[PDB]
């Protein structure tokens, strides 16, 4: 089972993964981009430049208005939209079809991106970070409530058209290897977490924990890079750099701004050190890490492979994202409020490391590292 559902994702690197969804009777198809940093399921609904595709409400026998409008600011710029109800499935999903709430945007600046392939956004986050307010049930909440899918979805995010998985319902073993091993979800909101240690090539860190969680640590696949607290960011820099020094590499390299390129196939993979998170475990005092390589923080962007330093600084907290995720198989334990990862099937690597995810290891006093 959860073979209708793998390889459902699709994804533009930068831009996010997507899913096939269809709204609407009869059933309009769209991309929606798969977020697990935001709560809302919203979808384009009235022309834009940038999309080629767009809900048209006016010819769904099933639409119902909610009479309510949603603006919602991001970054420099922003989106509008109309609240309201209709039937949504996922073709390669769950065999179900829910009415839900949406979010017909239809008024944007700055939003869509120039020439992407999803015309909207599955908030699969919890209600509280909600637009416009946590009374708007997120999508797979109606989802969970109105069939019997099992509260609990996971993801596997390949890279390099990057593909993934999501397996609604379920857990599809084809989809890692070795053990899964969870950390409690600390709030309902985002997929929070806490970060306990955290180590550049077996060296620590060695900073409050709390500072790792400052002020907040998220599993989000809305967003590209492993994205840190500036303290953070800045230790992880300096010791990456000192970790990776028999070549050297333009300041703008550390900033995202500037590439590194070698001989197609010569990416000196191992001068670069591997980065570990140890997360909060389930049990006492427990914890266990989960390890990337340079090949999840170096983005991949002629005869030469060239790439982006994919680990950026943050200022709303630390933001485990793809280049995180790309490396595990990531369950979303609703149910039970904790998050499982396992080394993913699908994962880059070379011949000599490999992600990993391992444990357990004692960690003594771990709510402290939990930012308040
Ligand atoms: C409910 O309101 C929003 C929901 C999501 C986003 C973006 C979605 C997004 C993702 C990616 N992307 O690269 O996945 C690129 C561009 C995007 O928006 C244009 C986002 C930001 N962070 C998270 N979790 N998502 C922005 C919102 F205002």
Known sequence: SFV??????????????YVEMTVGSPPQTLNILVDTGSSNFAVGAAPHPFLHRYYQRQLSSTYRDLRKGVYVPYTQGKWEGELGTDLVSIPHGPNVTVRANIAAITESDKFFINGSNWEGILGLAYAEIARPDDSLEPFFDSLVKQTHVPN????????????????????????????????????????????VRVEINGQDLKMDCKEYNYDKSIVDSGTTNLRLPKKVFEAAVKSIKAASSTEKFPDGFWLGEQLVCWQAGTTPWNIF?????????????????????????????????????????????????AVIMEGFYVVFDRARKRIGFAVSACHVHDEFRTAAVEGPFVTLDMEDCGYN
């Open 4 to 17: 209708e559902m793998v390889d459902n994702l699709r994804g533009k690197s930068g831009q996010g993964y």
């Open 152 to 195: 609990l979805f996971s993801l596997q995010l390949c890279g390099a058209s990057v593909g993934g998985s999501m397996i609604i319902g379920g857990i599809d073993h084809s989809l890692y290897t070795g053990s899964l091993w969870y950390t409690p979800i600390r709030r309902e909101w985002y997929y929070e977490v806490i970060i």
């Open 273 to 321: 050190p591997v980065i570990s998170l140890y997360l909060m475990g389930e049990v006492t005092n427990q914890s266990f890490r989960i390890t990337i390589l340079p090949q999840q923080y170096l983005r991949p962007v002629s005869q030469d492979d060239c790439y982006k330093f994919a680990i950026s600084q943050s200022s709303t907290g630390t933001v485990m994202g």
